[PDB]
Amino acid sequence: KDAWEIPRESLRLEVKLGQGCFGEVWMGTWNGTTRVAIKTLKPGTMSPEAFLQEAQVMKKLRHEKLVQLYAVVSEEPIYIVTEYMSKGSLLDFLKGETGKYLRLPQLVDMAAQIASGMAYVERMNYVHRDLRAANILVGENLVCKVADFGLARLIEDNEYTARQFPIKWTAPEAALYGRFTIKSDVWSFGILLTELTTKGRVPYPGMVNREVLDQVERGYRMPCPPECPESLHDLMCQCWRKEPEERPTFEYLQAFLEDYFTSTEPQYQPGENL
Ligand SMILES: COc1cc(-c2nn(CCN3CCC(N(C)C)CC3)c3ncnc(N)c23)ccc1NC(=O)OC(C)(C)C
C-alpha cells in the first residue's frame, strides 16, 4: 500500500490549469485510464526525501472533504497526483462567473464542508498550516475539499521564485513564533469565512502585510463584512481570540455551520449579494 511512487512516463500532462509561485497545475491522465490533477514543483523548492516522509503521513489522511493523494513522482521536478476537482480553487470559483450567484446558504454550506475536513485533520492530530480559499477545491454540486495540507512546512524558494507568505491568514503566534497548531488553523478558518462572505476578497482591505501584523498585534480584528449577519461575524471573532486554547474546535465550527439557518439565523432573508 506504500507503492505509490510512479514513473513520470505514467502521466500525460494534457491541459495547463494555471501557474503558482512554485510550479504548475495540470489536468492529465494517469496509466492511460484515470483523470487526475498534476501539481509540479520547481527543482530546489522541496526536499524529495522530506516530501516522501511527509507523503507517508498524508497518504493515511482519508476523508470525503480532503483531496486524495493518488501518487507522486519523487525525482525533481516532483509531481504530486491527486483527484481532479472540476471547478478548481474555491478562491477562483468565488471570483468567477458562478460566484456572483452564491448566497449565504451556499457559502455557509461550503464553510461547513471545509470545517468537516478540518475536523478530520483535528481528530488525526494533524495541522494544515496554510488554510485559505486558494487551498480549497470545488467539484460538482458545490463539493469542497481541503488541499495542500502539510506542504507549507517543506516549501522553500529557489533563485527564480525568490524574485517574487500568507501573513493575512496566519495566527499571530504562528506568524511571529512559528507556533503552528490546529488552533492556528482555526484562526485561518476565521479569515477563510471572510473570503466566503465577500465572495473572494483579500482580507484586511487596503492594508499591506506589515500593517496587518502591526494592527492585529494591538487587537485589531476585521469588522462584519457587508450584508454578513452579526452572528456569523461573532463566529469569525471566536476564531480570532488571542489565546489559542480559547478558539473553537473544528468539531464545534462544523456543527454551528451545519445548523446555522435553523439554530442561529432563522430570520435570514436574501439581500443584494448574500
Ligand atoms: C495534484 O495536486 C494538487 C492539485 C490541486 C489543484 N489545484 N487546482 C487549481 C489550479 N488553479 C490554481 C489557481 C489558478 N488561478 C489563480 C489562476 C488557476 C489554477 C486544481 N484544480 C483541479 N483539481 C485539482 N486537484 C487542483 C491542489 C492541490 C494539490 N496537491 C495537494 O493537495 O497535495 C497533497 C494531497 C499532497 C497535500
Residue numbers in the entry: 260 to 423, 427 to 536
Give passages from the manuscript.
The novel SRC inhibitor eCF506 displays subnanomolar activity against SRC, a potency that is on par with the current best-in-class SRC/ABL inhibitor dasatinib. The majority of SRC kinase inhibitors bind to the catalytic domain of SRC in its active conformation. To characterize the binding mode of eCF506, we co-crystalized human SRC (kinase domain) bound to eCF506 and determined the structure to 1.5 Å (for crystallographic and refinement statistics see Supplementary Table S1). Remarkably, the structure revealed that, contrary to our previous prediction, eCF506 binds to the native inactive conformation of the SRC kinase. In this conformation, the C-helix is moved out and the K298-E313 salt bridge (a hallmark of active kinases) is not formed, thereby switching kinase activity off. Remarkably, co-crystal structure analysis reveals that eCF506 induces and stabilizes the native inactive conformation of the SRC kinase domain, where the C-helix is displaced away from the active site and breaks the salt bridge between E313 in the C-helix and the catalytic K298 (39, 52). Hence the mode of binding of eCF506 is optimal for inhibiting SRC but not ABL, providing a sound explanation for this unique selectivity feature. Structurally speaking, the mode of binding of eCF506 to SRC (DFG-in, C-helix-out) is analogous to that of the dual HER2/EGFR inhibitor lapatinib on its targets. Biophysical characterization of the hydrodynamic radius of full length SRC (human SRC 84–536) in the absence (Apo) and presence of dasatinib or eCF506 show that, whereas dasatinib induces opening of the SRC structure, eCF506 maintains SRC in a more compact conformation, similar to the Apo form. We show that the inactive conformation of the SRC kinase domain induced by eCF506 is relayed to the full-length protein, keeping the protein in a compact conformation, likely as seen in the autoinhibited SRC structure. When SRC is forced into a closed conformation by eCF506, its SH2 domain is not available to bind to the FAK-pY397 docking site and form the active complex with FAK.
The SRC kinase, product of the first cellular proto-oncogene identified (1–6), emerged as a potential therapeutic target in the early 1980s. Although decades of research have assisted in elucidating the central role of this nonreceptor tyrosine kinase in the transduction of multiple oncogenic signals, either via receptor tyrosine kinases, cell-to-cell or extracellular matrix-to-cell communications, accumulating evidence of additional roles for SRC in cancer keeps it in the spotlight. Predominantly inactive in noncancerous cells, SRC is aberrantly activated in many cancer types, including breast, colon, prostate, pancreatic, and ovarian cancers. In the native autoinhibited conformation of SRC, the SH2 and SH3 domains interact with the kinase domain and form a compact structure that blocks macromolecular assemblies with other proteins.
